[PDB]
Amino acid sequence: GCDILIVYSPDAEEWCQYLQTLFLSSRQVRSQKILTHRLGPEASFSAEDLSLFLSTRCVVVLLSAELVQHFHKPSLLPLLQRAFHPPHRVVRLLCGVRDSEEFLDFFPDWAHWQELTCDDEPETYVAAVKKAIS
């Protein structure tokens, strides 16, 4: 590991615990190292942390309102571009944020991520991180 990294902000806390339990329940990914990193506003990342961002095999981005606010911090954005790459390794879950063309200004390969919604079947969630680590 790290194999699967769930990046989220505190407003999407429960979505994060939901996916953890689902991923640990499922045969395709239960066996993998599944870590989480909560973004803001209490902190930036520790040495051992920003490591994980760059080192993980697959990233799952919980797209909440509080999370995209971090896309607007220029000290931080360049790290996120290098972390959320390459696009076939990135999954986003829309958490009360409508998808948009503006995101292409922050992440140029945005359109090539795997996208999930709040009303997707659980099998869809797991198939996406299965496809992303494989």
Residue numbers in the entry: 6 to 139
Give verbatim excerpts from the published study on this entry.
The structure was solved at 2.5 Å using data derived from protein crystals in which the lysine residues were dimethylated and single-wavelength anomalous dispersion phasing with 5-amino-2,4,6-triiodoisophthalic acid monohydrate. There was a single molecule in the asymmetric unit, and the structure reveals that the N-terminal region adopts a typical TIR domain fold. The electrostatic potential of the solvent-accessible surface of BCAP reveals distinct regions of negative and positive potential in addition to hydrophobic patches, suggesting that the TIR domain of BCAP may interact with diverse TIR domain-containing proteins. The isolated TIR domain of BCAP is monomeric both in the crystal and in solution, a feature shared with most non-plant TIR domains, suggesting that vertebrate TIR domain-containing proteins require other domains to promote self-oligomerization: leucine-rich repeats (LRRs) for the TLR, a death domain for MyD88, and the DBB domain and likely the ANK repeats for BCAP.
One such adaptor, B-cell adaptor for phosphoinositide 3-kinase (BCAP),4 functions in linking the B-cell receptor (BCR) and the co-receptor CD19 to the activation of PI3K via interaction with the SH2 domains on the regulatory p85 subunit. Architecturally, BCAP contains well defined ankyrin repeats and a Dof/BANK/BCAP (DBB) domain; the latter was first reported in the Drosophila protein Dof, where it is required for FGF-dependent signaling, and a homologous domain exists in the B-cell scaffold with ankyrin repeat (BANK) protein. A recent study predicted the existence of a TIR domain in the N-terminal region of BCAPL that is required for negative regulation of inflammatory signaling by TLRs. Here we present the structure of the N-terminal domain of BCAP, firmly establishing it as a TIR domain.
